[PDB]
Design a protein around this ligand. Sequence first.
Ligand code: SF4
Ligand code: SF4
Lengths: 531, 532
Amino acid sequence: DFHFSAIFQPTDPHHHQTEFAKVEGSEKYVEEVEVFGRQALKVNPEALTILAHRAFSDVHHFFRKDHLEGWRRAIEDPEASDNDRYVATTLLKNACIAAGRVLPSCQDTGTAIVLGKRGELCWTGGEDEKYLSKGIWNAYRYHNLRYSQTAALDMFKECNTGDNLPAQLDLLAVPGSDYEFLFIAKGGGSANKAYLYQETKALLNPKSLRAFIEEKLKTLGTAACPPYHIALVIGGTSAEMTMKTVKLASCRYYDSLPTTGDKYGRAFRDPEWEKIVMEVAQKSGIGAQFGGKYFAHQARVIRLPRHGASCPVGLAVSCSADRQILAHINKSGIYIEQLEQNPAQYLPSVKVDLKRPIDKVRQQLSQYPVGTRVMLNGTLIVARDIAHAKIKEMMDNGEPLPEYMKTSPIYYAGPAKTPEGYASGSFGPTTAGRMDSYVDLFQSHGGSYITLAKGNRSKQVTDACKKHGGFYLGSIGGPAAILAKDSIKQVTCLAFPELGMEAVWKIEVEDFPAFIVVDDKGNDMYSKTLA
Amino acid sequence: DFHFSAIFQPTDPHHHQTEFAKVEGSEKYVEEVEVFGRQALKVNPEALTILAHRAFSDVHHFFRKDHLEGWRRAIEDPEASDNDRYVATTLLKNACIAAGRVLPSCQDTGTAIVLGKRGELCWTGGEDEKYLSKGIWNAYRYHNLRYSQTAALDMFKECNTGDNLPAQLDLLAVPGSDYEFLFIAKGGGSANKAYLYQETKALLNPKSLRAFIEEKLKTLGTAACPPYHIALVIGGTSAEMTMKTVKLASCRYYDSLPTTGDKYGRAFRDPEWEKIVMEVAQKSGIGAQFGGKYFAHQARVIRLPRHGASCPVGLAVSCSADRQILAHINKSGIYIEQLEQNPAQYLPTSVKVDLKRPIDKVRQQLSQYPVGTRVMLNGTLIVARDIAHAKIKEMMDNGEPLPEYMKTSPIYYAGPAKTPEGYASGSFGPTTAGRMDSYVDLFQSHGGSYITLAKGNRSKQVTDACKKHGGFYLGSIGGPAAILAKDSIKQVTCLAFPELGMEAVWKIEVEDFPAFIVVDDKGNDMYSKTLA
Ligand code: SF4
Ligand code: SF4
């Protein structure tokens, strides 16, 4: 009466649908042998270093076809808004710059994640984590990427690790003699838009599920640089299993799952509800960051088994920096997913002078409604999470708001490393919402009247800007390389150099595009679509 | 300049601090060999079946010493409330019944979870998942446990799998030639109290973190049968990694981690903030289910590295059905964590309510007493939980009346485990009340569900409903499923929806069934102060 049924039963478990290139000469790192009557594979662990290094290098300069096609679709669709087409065009041009292999597509070169599946008879010597980490260390050290990992010395005292380690290394034991991988360079912004809900049987009917989807998609907002790959997971054997599944779904790792369930409780993709998610996304009007039809590229919906008392639900996105690479090691050597090296084939405002007293800039901005596209020229002061926290602490000790918070618009950003001979490394915005708790306080103390970042912000910021005569400008989110190449002319570290990328910077920009998102009158260009 | 630093650096990676027993003769399942100059271990996969079968049998009848010590502490502490002592005593007595090996400690015998760590040179033949699942299948089929897993035939159509499969099988590739395990039989109620928050650097200061902890602990409420083992994880490399870590922390799997961080970003336990979690838990007044000091057994707090832009936070509990077992396979055979077989050594006023009356007379008697009053129920309960409620609501939406059997007796939210031979009932404790909250006003407006019996605090809509309709919510003690079955439940019959499993509608006769009046017919709620 016993019948074993794996939860996940992909029809393409080895991802034959993906194109791979072999690393030249890599057959020298492997040797097929036969032990106690079974086929095995000896793998020199140096292969793991070589592979991780190449994967976490390549992935910052190239994209998958389903990602690129999405941007082309947003540009060619008659039903797309002007803002849809503008954002999609900008991201594709950004991808073209990144394919030059010098600037990464986003300044946030992400957390390094490895899903590895080592066969029972795949023998590495066992030091996989160290050799994988060395390859990751190599990728981030010798390329123009960014060190984004923050170590906790105690509960509150932190420092940058200075090398983008530690990685997330999930190494699984599986049948056979090969070694298979999914590498993810996961941006913090989209990592933050991974949500867990604890629901019940009361959710599990068409009317309730539909309303739930409408509600939760809005809470994604524009803060992770849409168009999104949206993943939804209904059910799961535990919260952590539900969240792992929604991550992998967003990476299209589970695309070959069955599309029907059975009495043994197997997982399945649900194309019907994928279509419903896409309809909700399109009809939301949220669009590709600034209103329109292209809130989402595509959707993945996986239904999982559940304990009778439980219904975990996971929602997550892959952002404009859509970065994953499949790979495997076998008797012929090292194979790595081939990304699109020619993104160009997918390609078919008010001037604001910052070189004035900031009150003059505020005055000019006040003349325009939210939704107005502006082009910024001049000085930006750059500060994000830790600098804001330090500055609040200083003021709490009676010290003044620093002068540099009062002279210029505040750009929330952290740069990637500067290539030799370049003015700037990749240098796009980080998410505005994380700084919301500082705005009223800083404005009340005569600073941060104008901020520049991406994403919708909370009502406290709208109220602050109305009370103090302030403004929030939304940069396009994602196009870090073209911004660095065309707009950023000079970069200087101003304060807190120990914070690395999170130091305060002073930069000079030309033709820097943005939208007026919040004005000085109580208006918010997201108030209709993200209410 | 490259330095490798594992995120997790336990000082006791093989859990030498845990006591293990050897499965007799099990060295016959393993053989030491050497290939290419390296030591390897051949393991007959039947060992995985044997091990999983024993783990998922044992864990339902015995507990760890640190769990039992917590209950004793709740009894002997002068600062424990009278209700703390009463609840802890009941749970300890329940444990004594469970140790007889016939009745499981909770009716919710849980999801079967396996964390396995297979050495590079540990060779099983590779069919680990099947052989582990067969052992799990054995444990739930041949013992008086419960089939709790719900398969989705399509997005909305569901059926019970009938065998408590599928399991969650997380098999990791690690160095060496052994096979190490953590088995968890995870109740749905405590699984539901695993929460992910997406926070920021603005959280990371003493004042903000303290206020945050105060706020979130209350949202745990009493719906997962406290005293809790509370785990809190600050940071993490991804949401799923944060949630995995908070699960393992709640199982005390990470107890031997370092207690300081470093510039390489290693994980650490934080004893100071563990103490603060316990102070918040104690000062909350929430108590062991019904007011007092013993909201929590103990706390685990793990600080993790984070992306500069991110701060995932995980909060989770282990409930009164605290069920995990460590194990390992090596050249000497199969070893399994030894649990406490004699819980009795840890062991150091109510209104009688006759339910065999018209329900309107019962409502009248209940109306005489304030919330917090202890009652003893005698007579008939109609049993129905999540799926039965959904089916009945569906019927009413199609114009059918509320069935008569929903009007004649109090409604007990529960799903029983299988009945042992010669027993009146298998383990049969309460289900979380909050999950049925959306049905109460509707059912009461149609003349039924005036009196409900389950566990956990409920939402304001239920308080309002009971005041509008002259209703009551009674809180059973959460957890003591075995002693309820042995002492209180006298007869069980299936009344409706036989196609459902443990989730059919049942009619049961009970005696001396203890409960508290949690919500009355006047707008009062005994949790309104502590869970506000
Ligand atoms: S594309 Fe946007 S959300 Fe994604 S990593 Fe870059 S800044 Fe963050
Ligand atoms: S002890 Fe309570 S929360 Fe835990 S499984 Fe049993 S009923 Fe659910």
